[PDB]
Paper text:
Transcriptional co-regulators of the SRO group are characterized by a conserved PARP domain and a C-terminal RST (RCD1 SRO TAF4) domain that binds transcription factors. Although the PARP domain in SRO proteins is strictly conserved, residues of the His–Tyr–Glu triad deviate from the consensus sequence in SRO proteins. Liu et al. (2014) proposed that the bread wheat (T. aestivum) Ta-SRO1 protein can catalyze poly-ADP-ribosylation reactions although the His–Tyr–Glu is replaced by Leu–His–His in this protein. We present a structural analysis of the Ta-sro1 PARP domain at 2.1 Å resolution together with in vitro and in vivo assays of biochemical function, providing strong evidence that Ta-sro1 is unlikely to have PARP activity.
The domain adopts the typical PARP fold with a β–α–loop–β–α signature at the donor site that binds NAD+. The donor site loop (D-loop) occludes the proposed active site of Ta-sro1 and is only partially resolved in the structure with little interpretable electron density for amino acids Met334–Gly336. The structure confirms that the His–Tyr–Glu triad is not conserved in Ta-sro1. The position of the conserved His residue is taken by Ta-sro1 Leu312. The Tyr that stacks with the nicotinamide ribose ring in canonical PARP enzymes is replaced by His344 in Ta-sro1. The catalytic Glu that is specifically required for the PAR chain elongating polymerase activity of PARPs is replaced by Ta-sro1 His407. Thr343 (Ala in Ta-SRO1) is located close to the proposed active site and its side chain is positioned toward the hydrophobic core of the protein formed by residues Leu345, Val330, Leu328, Ile419, Val415, and Ile410. However, our Ta-sro1 PARP domain crystal structure reveals that the Ta-sro1 Thr343 side chain points in the opposite direction and toward a hydrophobic area forming the basis of the postulated NAD+-binding site. The second polymorphic amino acid, Val250 (Gly in Ta-SRO1) is positioned on the opposite side of the domain and located close to the N-terminus of the crystallized construct.
Author numbering: 250 to 332, 337 to 431
Write the structure that this text describes.
């Protein structure tokens, strides 16, 4: 559903955003450089995790972006991550924490923030400690990390899974407020 982006952005959490703050919302490319349909690949990965774990645990999440990394996606279908003290991996904010991902993302010279709404295959999650140097699942039973099992504020995707479990779906460009 197209409305889900503004749904999460404007009315989602306690802190809202305004339409004037949204510079752009854009779909990501359908194929990567090598012509593979990106959504179909993600569906394939979704089915594989579902069959292995019993549930794929697909979430919406916000990926902090720089100008360059958004360009890699929007020009070439390539996923690049910018450098969240919870392990060595890709850190994402839960769907309702766009303001948190906003407060934890960079603001450039033109007063602009960038982020991407992704569907993420999390699979089985475990706790990652703050300041942890973890870079992979603890053991074969887990796939991804959270900072808190009851009240997650951060999702963590390990390097080995970034190219198969993160599907960037919308690019979002926001003007710093007022």
């Amino acid at each position: 559903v197209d409305s889900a982006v503004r749904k999460l952005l404007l009315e989602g959490a306690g802190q809202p955003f305004s339409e004037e703050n949204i510079i752009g919302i854009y779909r990501t490319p359908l194929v990567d450089q090598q012509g593979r349909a990106r959504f179909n690949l993600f569906q394939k990965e979704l089915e594989a995790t579902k069959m292995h774990r019993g549930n794929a645990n697909v979430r919406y999440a916000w990926l902090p972006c720089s100008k360059d990394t958004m360009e890699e996606m929007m020009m070439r279908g390539v996923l690049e991550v910018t450098k969240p003290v919870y392990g060595i991996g890709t850190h994402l904010a839960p769907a309702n924490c766009a303001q948190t991902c906003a407060s934890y993302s960079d603001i450039d010279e033109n007063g602009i923030m960038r982020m991407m709404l992704c569907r993420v295959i999390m699979g089985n999650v475990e706790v990652v400690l703050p300041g942890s140097k973890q870079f992979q699942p603890t053991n074969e039973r887990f796939d991804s990390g959270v900072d808190d099992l009851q009240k997650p504020k951060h999702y963590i995707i390990w390097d080995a899974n970034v190219h198969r479990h993160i599907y960037a779906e919308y690019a979002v460009v926001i003007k710093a407020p007022s």
